[PDB]
Structure 1
Amino acid sequence: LIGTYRHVDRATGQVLTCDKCPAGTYVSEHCTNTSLRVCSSCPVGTFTRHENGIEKCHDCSQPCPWPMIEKLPCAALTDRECTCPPGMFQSNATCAPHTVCPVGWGVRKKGTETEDVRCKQCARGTFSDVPSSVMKCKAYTDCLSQNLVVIKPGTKETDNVCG
């Protein structure tokens, strides 16, 4: 199942086909004609992403620069991965809070760790009564569908009042 790699045995010069070691480990001892290769777990701070025949694991990258945080840790199988925290997006070599769409506007495109929120003015029939970087405009309460009349029209900031 697991792959193999060729190794020149030091003592004999024999070219051997040894078993690769699984990701998360490295070869602490190559095979010989009479012994299986031995694998060991990557020490803290290092990793290997695939089956390998290497003698040392790779060092993880440096700690994330604040305000960036880890979305993946430095672990036996993975190098740490950094990202702007939720509510922020990667901007000019750093992190910036997402745009807050004001009342009368709503989120058109959700903000991510690399792209800012996209706001749009609430379309007729919808409203947003709170400042927010996540909420979309909401549809008016349907008066008719409640056998009521609109006693007070809504705006892009407020729901219509039914009665």
Structure 2
Amino acid sequence: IGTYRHVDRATGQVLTCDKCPAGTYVSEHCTNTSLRVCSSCPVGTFTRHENGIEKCHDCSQPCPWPMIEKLPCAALTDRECTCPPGMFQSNATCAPHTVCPVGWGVRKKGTETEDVRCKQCARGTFSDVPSSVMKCKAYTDCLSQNLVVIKPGTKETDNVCGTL
């Protein structure tokens, strides 16, 4: 743990005190005969690193709905807001991800900051359900199934497998 210089009120001595760890602040500086005392950051406040400060930092305002906290206001961290899962941030607030329709599939997973990117299923794959998450699935292999392709598949359906 590191140190900081402090000027002693009563004597004018420049002391070398021990820093307080992240999550605490200095509630009593060291003097020529006693060590500095650290206290924990009160509710509502934080300090990110080992410090010598006298009051902890204030946490930001609460997250504006529909945003939620991916980090809380705690001793060591300011609160951090995010759009909840299945939404992404655009301008002001939160929009739901694109839902890829049947016959399309996710090419790029949507994130808290970018929307999902869809592509039409390529030949040999299909997607049969609307989803903002699912990829195009490859057809069931009929050859390696001991069966044959009764009905071909489409970008929306699997091929159907059987005999004769």
TM class by smaller structure: over 0.9
Measured after TM superposition, the shift of residue 77 of structure 1 is 0.1
Distance 2:102 2:30 in 1: 69
Aligned length, in residue pairs:
162
Unaligned ranges ≥5, structure 2: none
Distance in 2 between residues matched to 1:3 and 1:109, nearest whole Å: 45
Identity %: 100
The ranges of structure 1 where at least 4 consecutive aligned residues each deviate by more than 3 angstroms after the TM superposition are none
Residues 57-77 of structure 1 show CA distances to partners (whole Å, capped at 9, x for unaligned) of 000000000000000000000
TM-score by length of 2: 0.98
RMSD of equivalent CA atoms: 0.4
Question: TM-score, normalised to structure 1's length?
Answer: 0.99
Deviation at 1:92, TM superposition (A): 1.6
Question: Alpha-carbon deviations, 1:99-155, whole Å to 9, x = none?
Answer: 000000000000000000000000000000000000001010000001211000000
Q: SS of 1:53's equivalent?
A: coil
C-alpha distance in structure 1 between counterparts of 2:133 and 2:37, whole Å: 52
Partner of 2:77: 78
Q: 2: distance between equivalents of 1:147 and 1:34?
A: 87
CA distance in structure 1 between the aligned counterparts of 2:92 and 2:54, rounded to whole angstroms: 35
Shift of 1:53: 0.2
Per-residue CA deviations over 1:26-72 (Å, capped at 9, x if unaligned) read 00000001000000000000000000000000000000000000000
